[PDB]
């Protein structure tokens, strides 16, 4: 009814998406975690590997507080692109894909207290340097590294939502 559209229209009033939450008075804390749907092929010829991930971040933006009967607010992608989200990027990524079929494969939820939860579906090709001295008896530890591109340690800090071991969950069939 009218309450939903009114809250949606009145959230962005005076919102500046060029500025991170708590700019100049606190550090934006981002709780992140990953669900690996499939650990894709590992191409030792290219020293790369593919991984399909539900990558979901969460933070707090008091600018987007609201009140209503509803405690959860879903944002469409047009409005989700109109607010500040972390500029997370993969340090060892080569060519990653943000899925868009049939509509952008991302979601943005807002809680009444201003907590944002931002989920994405990604296919990331990442570098895996290999020591092939003991080939074919060799073993490797392929990394997946990510973080903010623009915001330094004193502005944005990432953390794991749960214990770090339990914050990256690989699917049984994946």
């Amino acid at each position: 009814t009218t309450v939903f559209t009114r809250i949606l229209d009145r959230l962005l009033d005076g919102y500046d998406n060029r500025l991170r939450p708590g700019l100049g008075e606190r550090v934006t804390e981002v709780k992140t975690d990953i669900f690996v749907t499939s650990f894709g092929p590992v191409s030792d010829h290219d020293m790369e590997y593919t991984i399909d991930v539900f990558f979901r971040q969460s933070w707090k933006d008091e600018r987007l507080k609201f009140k209503g009967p509803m405690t959860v607010l879903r944002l469409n992608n047009l409005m989700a692109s109109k607010i500040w989200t972390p500029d997370t990027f993969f340090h060892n990524g080569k060519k990653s894909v943000a899925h868009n079929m049939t509509m952008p494969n991302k979601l943005l939820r807002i809680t009444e207290d201003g907590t944002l939860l931002y989920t994405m579906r990604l296919t990331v090709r990442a570098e895996c340097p290999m020591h092939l001295e003991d080939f074919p008896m060799d073993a490797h530890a392929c990394p997946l590294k990510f973080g903010s591109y623009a915001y330094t340690r004193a502005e944005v800090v990432y953390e794991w939502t749960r214990e770090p071991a339990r914050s990256v969950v690989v699917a049984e069939d994946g």
Partner: nanobody
Amino acid sequence: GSLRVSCAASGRTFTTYIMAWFRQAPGKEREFLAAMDQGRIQYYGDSVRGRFTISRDYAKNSVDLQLDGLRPEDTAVYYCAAGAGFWGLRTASSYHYWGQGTQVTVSS
């Protein structure tokens, strides 16, 4: 006090390997301190987070550890390690190469 412990590797180029420092106090327990990667990413242990700083000179193939805010309880033997971190990056079993070690004592 302030101190700096350097580690020079000879016989192999560890540009693509992870170079780390470990500590062993009396009692036979080896403790992870710091590690640095080919991507220049610094990992630290909780006990020495923000106190000890790890750096690598890839041209010289060396790894340095700057120790600051020493305390009497920090007396121990410090070991330099290298090797790709398989099942590890915080476990001594994942490192194939180790050095003689250096003794450190602090008196108050």
